[PDB]
């Protein structure tokens, strides 16, 4: 059916990063774009933690994104050239926290084609022009100046479509107020095709062509052309004018050639290699990430080598020519995809795998514990300054935001005791690899509990000035406890509210005298336990407490409320003015007083005669209940809270009645919510007040801006409800159960257990039920290969003095993966490590090692086919595992006994094969698919005996799902082909063929004839077989926009609908729910048709283009577009509700029902 797909987890890996003054002020907004979504942060850099200022979804992939400011422009407009031809230039207004489109320049057809410009987009330093170019034979320079109102004075772009001129790197040079220029590394590829022997293909060389665009002539011509024999992998441009020379540093293998367009010297700064680097010398040190951090006059250049160490470079050019660039390794840096170093302690390093680092500057940036390799520093033309892994003395990484990308493997189960299931995403590369197990519950960022289950847990602080709850009085009838609200709440004797008796209320109502409603009455209790306990009205205990800033109405049985008024000393003294309600007041609350008001305008108590009596708390009008919020049923509580204000009586039944909390009596409208008595009081959730209808279905009448709406929350089950304010979040809903508090964000705890190699396949043992995963870091030096290379380097450099000690230090400690980058090289070399993490503990209870050229292709620890139900693990290791080109020695399928019921990876024996057996499953024997050959062999511990082997497959076997005498296998060509594997007949005949050609990388059996496939282009297609050389019909199809790693048709959330959970390699996780409700599907289709007209996509490619970029979309409903329509503005929401012929609150209720349907 139709699939209302919603992404539960956003993609964590940032596809691009920009920074600058994009917030319109001195707050340097930095936007990390994760593909279709971009999060911009312009918070305080002295906080040390990243806080995103805005988030924008464009429904498209940006081919090239940048952020540049005009001449005099304090706001850096972001220019994004997407796959579509609408290159969007938008000035970002942080007042609306959104980028208003100044222009949407149309260029051409959708997709980043070879001739579709916008693959490389840059801007001039004066903000006068923007150049967008394709891979080859297409370039454009749009003259976008500043208008009279500082608007986009855009023009038609000058075309620089030079034939077969591939631009390796293009950068707009800083020309100041003169005519600007742009340098592109053009390479004439026409001579390569002209020479049929490839002689001109070998003799071709790049040329940095700096083309100057005369704006007065309105024409761009190639001004300078510096040819380089070495190809330019990347280039960094020195800023001209007062910021330095107008030069560029083209990077190569241990050579950054800095030169300017004119009489300048080509200063070849050598990239400083590590002192006795254990990595091989084939990996030349090039500037993978470069960032020019500029001061008021000069500019330092932080660059990362092939090892990736952060090397700060000075500039002793002396305004004549490029002479010296003192590249000293200031700090050892981790595996980062990019690095941008702004000012005021901001240095955002986006990690390809692991944690992206935001750093604060400590030293001046030149604090290098390693050697310095200047451009004027001479050498022997064979190495550089031996700059080893230095300590981080220049700056400190103040934030390390862990990203799930690249999420290779996944294992989601509710094995652990948590409010939501733990999903372990195995991710990362090499030693910098971990499995992050995340469990929600629904913001379970931190775990904290109040001390016991007391009568009330309220902040009876030292005074009113104590904003943090240093002593929240969790006071019961037996005793009292003091809890610290810092997610470290426990029991202590520092509450001071005299809660040895039953303290019903204990909160700092006065300036320093906390009001405590207790059986003694109303007590003014100080920072210590000095409670002046005046009597309440009557000798009974304080049943209700309408506490305000000045007068606290302590109401006993019969509704008699004694007014503990504030004296001149700040204490609460019980005055003689007391009024009785209709019956016994159950619970009370007082609305907040104004700044000129002497006391509260309305304090309301919920009597037992189905009413809430509200009186003025001022001493001139005390004990005068005017407003009567008459409850519909017998009221269990009252809450008289601001936003005029609302005074509500909540009942034990399903009706709570709210009226106007004022001197005039309002209309008691009774709204509905779990068969429990209500405990409506003051709560905090997203800056809006609420009254908690305490029930099993814990609803909150949120009175946001004089309108109370009651609904439940998406947390775990409970019986009561209250507010929540701790170190995890500032305001939330605590569904209070019996010694439990379900968190509602009106966040998942993730623990990352490390792995030895890059993670390949996460499997579970049959007997242990524990994660026996296999990690394969192929095309790199292994752990055993790295130890052997370290010992070989020790034996090589021991021949000398101090060189033998340096050799021993290089053997003991190389460049680390988390410190200075992993020293690893080779093509056929491959690390394989089978780590058996426990079912509860992420630490590996077993380690199995393979050959140094062998990659663990698959992990499968289950019961053996030849043996009984004992877990025998079949682990395939492909030796000499080289990816590009096709080079592998062979697949050794090690059969392992899996000792301690799988907790010890004891390898029994192995069975070799020439091909790679990437699939090994049980088939009624065991089907092992070694490429195009699938053999049914006995799964013995010693050796396998094959019976029937079929080599009729096309390319390979990516993965086969078996549904009983039929297995559908994915291939590089076919998405899914179903062969009826009759193991009783010892044969396999293809009962279903394939017509759609797709390199499907995932498999999921939704039914006995439904097979899902996640293609290499990032399209999820669910194909059902036809009833009774015939293909299966693709019932559903969508394009997610990213390559989905795994997919499984299963109910991922707790209960709800049997959706399909898909995990992508970018860190995204989504649930596609098959909506069987045709009326709800038609309502969602009408809402999407309204939303596609109301809210346009910012990339220029529509949501239809995003969902049908590769293959056409079918049977999918866009819950992301439904969330965008919910996130639309108020007038646009009213227009969308008129277009869908409904209400905006009804559409929001339908979206909340779709979210709760899971």
């Amino acid at each position: 059916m139709f699939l209302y797909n919603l992404t539960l987890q956003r993609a964590t890996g940032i596809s691009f990063a920009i920074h600058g003054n994009f917030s319109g002020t001195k707050q340097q907004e930095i936007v990390v774009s994760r593909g279709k979504i971009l999060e911009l942060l312009r918070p305080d850099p002295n906080t040390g933690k990243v806080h995103t200022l805005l988030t924008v979804e464009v429904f498209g992939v940006i081919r090239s994104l940048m952020a540049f400011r005009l001449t005099g422009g304090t706001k850096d407009y972001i220019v994004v050239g997407s796959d579509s031809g609408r290159i969007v230039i938008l000035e970002y207004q942080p007042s609306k926290n959104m980028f208003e489109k100044i222009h949407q320049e149309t260029f051409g057809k959708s997709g980043c084609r070879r001739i579709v410009p916008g693959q490389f987009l840059a801007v001039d330093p004066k903000g006068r022009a923007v150049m967008i170019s394709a891979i080859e034979k297409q370039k454009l320079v749009y003259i976008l100046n500043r208008d009279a109102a500082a608007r986009l004075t855009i023009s038609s772009p000058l075309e620089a479509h030079k034939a077969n001129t591939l631009v390796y790197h293009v950068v707009g040079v800083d020309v100041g107020f003169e005519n600007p220029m742009f340098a592109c590394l053009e390479m004439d590829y026409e001579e390569a095709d002209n020479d049929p022997t490839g002689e001109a293909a070998a003799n071709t060389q790049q040329t940095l062509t700096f083309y100057e665009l005369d704006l007065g002539l309105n024409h761009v011509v190639r001004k300078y052309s510096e040819p380089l024999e070495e190809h330019g992998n990347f280039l960094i441009t020195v800023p001209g004018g007062s910021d330095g020379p107008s030069g560029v540093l083209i990077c190569s293998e241990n050579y950054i050639t800095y030169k300017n367009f004119g009489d300048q010297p080509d200063i070849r700064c050598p990239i400083p290699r590590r002192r006795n680097d254990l990595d091989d010398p084939e990996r030349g040190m090039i500037f993978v990430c470069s960032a020019t951090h500029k001061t008021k006059s000069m500019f330092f250049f932080l660059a990362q080598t092939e090892q990736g160490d952060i090397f700060k470079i000075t500039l002793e050019t002396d305004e004549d020519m490029v002479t010296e660039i003192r590249l000293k390794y200031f700090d050892t840096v981790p595996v980062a995809a990019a690095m941008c170093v702004l000012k005021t302690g901001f240095l955002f390093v986006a990690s390809e795998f692991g944690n992206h680092y935001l750093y604060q500057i400590a030293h001046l940036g030149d604090d290098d514990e390693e050697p310095e390799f200047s451009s004027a520093m001479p050498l022997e033309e064979g190495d550089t300054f031996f700059f080893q892994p230095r300590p981080l003395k220049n700056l400190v990484l103040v934030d390390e935001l862990d990203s799930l990308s690249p999420i290779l493997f996944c294992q989601i189960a509710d094995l652990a005791n948590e409010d939501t299931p733990q999903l372990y995403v195995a991710c990362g590369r090499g030693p910098r690899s971990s499995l992050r197990v995340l469990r929600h519950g629904v913001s379970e960022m931190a775990v904290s509990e109040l001390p016991g289950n007391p009568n009330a847990v309220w902040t009876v602080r030292r005074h009113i000035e104590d904003e943090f709850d240093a002593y929240i009085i969790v006071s019961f009838v037996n005793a009292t406890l003091v809890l610290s609200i810092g997610e470290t709440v426990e029991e202590v004797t520092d509450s001071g509210f005299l809660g040895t008796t039953p303290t019903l209320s204990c909160s700092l109502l006065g300036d320093d005298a906390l009001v405590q409603v207790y059986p003694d009455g109303i007590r003014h209790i100080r920072a210590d336990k000095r409670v002046n306990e005046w009597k309440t009205p009557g000798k009974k205990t304080i049943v209700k407490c309408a506490v305000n800033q000045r007068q606290v109405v302590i109401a006993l049985t019969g509704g008699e409320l004694v007014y503990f008024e504030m004296d001149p000393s700040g204490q609460l003294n019980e005055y003689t003015e007391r009024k009785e309600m209709s019956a016994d007041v159950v619970c009370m609350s007082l609305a907040n007083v104004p700044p000129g008001e002497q006391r509260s305008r309305f304090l309301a108590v919920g009597l037992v005669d189905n009413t809430v009596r509200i009186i003025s708390l001022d001493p001139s009008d005390c004990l005068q209940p005017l407003s009567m919020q008459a409850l519909p049923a017998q009221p269990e509580s009252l809450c008289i809270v601001e936003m005029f204000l609302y005074l509500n009586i909540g009942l034990q039944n399903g009706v709570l009645l709210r009226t106007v909390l004022d001197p005039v009596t309002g209309d008691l409208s009774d709204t509905r919510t779990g068969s429990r008595p209500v405990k409506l009081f003051r709560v905090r959730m997203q800056g809006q007040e609420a009254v908690l209808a305490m029930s099993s279905r814990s609803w909150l009448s949120y009175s946001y801006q004089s309108r109370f709406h009651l609904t439940p929350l998406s947390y775990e089950t409970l019986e009561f409800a209250s507010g929540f304010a701790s170190e995890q979040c500032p305001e939330g809903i605590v569904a209070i159960s019996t010694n439990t508090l379900r968190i509602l964000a009106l966040v998942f705890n993730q623990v990352a257990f490390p792995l030895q190699y890059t993670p390949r396949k996460f499997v579970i043992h049959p007997e242990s039920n524990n994660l026996i995963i296999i990690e394969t870091d192929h095309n790199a030096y292994t752990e055993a290969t790295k130890a052997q290379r370290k010992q070989q380097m020790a034996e090589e450099m021991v021949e000398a003095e101090l060189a033998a000690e340096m050799a021993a230090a290089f053997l003991n400690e190389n460049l680390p993966e988390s410190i200075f980058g992993a020293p690893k090289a080779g093509n056929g070399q491959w690390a394989s490590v089978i780590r058996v993490m426990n079912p509860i503990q992420g630490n590996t209870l077993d380690l199995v090692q393979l050959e140094q050229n062998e990659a663990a292709f698959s992990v499968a620890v289950c019961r053996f086919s030849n043996t009984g139900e004992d877990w025998y693990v079949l682990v395939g290791v492909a030796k000499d595992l080289i990816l590009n080109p096709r080079s592998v020695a062979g697949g050794f399928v090690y059969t392992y006994k899996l000792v301690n019921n799988g907790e010890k990876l004891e390898f029994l024996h192995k069975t070799p094969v020439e091909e790679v057996p990437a699939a090994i499953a049980p088939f009624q024997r065991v089907l092992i698919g070694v490429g195009k050959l699938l053999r049914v062999y006995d799964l013995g511990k010693k050796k396998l005996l094959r019976k029937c082997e079929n080599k009729h497959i096309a390319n390979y076997i990516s993965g086969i799902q078996t549904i009983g005498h039929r297995v559908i296998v994915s291939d590089v060509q076919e998405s899914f082909i179903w062969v009826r594997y009759k193991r009783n007949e010892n044969q396999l005949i293809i009962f279903a063929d394939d017509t759609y050609p797709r390199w499907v990388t995932t498999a999921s059996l939704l039914d006995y004839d439904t097979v899902a496939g996640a293609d290499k282009f990032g399209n999820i297609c669910v194909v059902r077989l036809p009833p009774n050389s015939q293909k299966a019909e693709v019932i559903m199809n969508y394009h997610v926009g990213e390559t989905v790693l795994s997919l499984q048709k299963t109910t991922l959330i707790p209960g709800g609908s049997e959706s399909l959970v898909y995990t992508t390699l970018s860190g995204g996780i989504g649930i596609l729910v098959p909506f069987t409700s045709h009326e709800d599907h038609d309502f969602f289709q009408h809402v999407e048709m309204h939303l596609r007209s109301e809210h346009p996509p910012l990339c220029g490619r529509d949501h239809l283009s995003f969902r049908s970029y590769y293959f056409p979309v079918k049977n999918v409903i866009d819950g992301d577009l439904c969330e965008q329509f919910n996130s639309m503005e108020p007038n646009k929401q009213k227009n969308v509700s008129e277009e869908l012929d409904r209400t905006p609150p009804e559409v929001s209720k339908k979206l909340e029902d779709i979210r709760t349907r899971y």
């Binding site: 189905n610 008459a630 519909p632 049923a633 009942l651 039944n653 399903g654 009706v655 009645l657 209309d667 008691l668 409208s669 009774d670 709204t671 509905r672």
Partner: protein
């Protein structure tokens, strides 16, 4: 209370388009899942 034809105060309508009071809607929600209009799916709506 259209059958009783009494005084109308604090009006509230259920999901089956039955117009009554707020306390009458509470009594109907506590009594039955269906309203008194045509026994339609009111689902105990004691809402304003």
């Amino acid at each position: 209370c259209f059958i009783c034809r009494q005084s109308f105060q604090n009006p509230v309508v259920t999901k089956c388009r039955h117009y009554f009071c707020e306390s009458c809607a509470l009594q109907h929600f506590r009594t039955t899942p269906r309203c008194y209009v045509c026994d339609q799916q009111t689902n105990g709506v004691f809402n304003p």
